[PDB]
Amino acid sequence: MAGDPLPKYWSYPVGLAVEINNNARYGCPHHVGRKGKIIEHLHSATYDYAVSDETGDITYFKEHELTPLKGGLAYVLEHHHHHH
C-alpha cells in the first residue's frame, strides 16, 4: 500500500457516516469518541467538513479528525442470488 490518494480537497462526500476519533483531543474537548454525519463541505485549513454529532450537535471537523464508517459486507455471501 503506497501512493497519494489526494484528488484536490474534499476526500469525503456529503452524507457519509463517520466517527470522531480521539485525535481531536486538543480542539474538541470531550467531543471525541462518538459518531456523526457529514452534512456540509467547508473550505478551511482547520476544518474540511461539518459533522452532525449523534447527540444532535453540529461541529466542524477536518479529514484528520474523522474516520469513515462502513456498513459491513464482511459476513455476506454474494455470488449466486437470483432476486427475492
UniProtKB/Swiss-Prot annotation:
It comes from the Bacteria. InterPro entries: YorP, YorP_sf. Pfam families: YorP (PF09629). Disulfide bonds: none annotated. This is SPbeta prophage-derived uncharacterized protein YorP. It comes from Bacillus subtilis (strain 168).
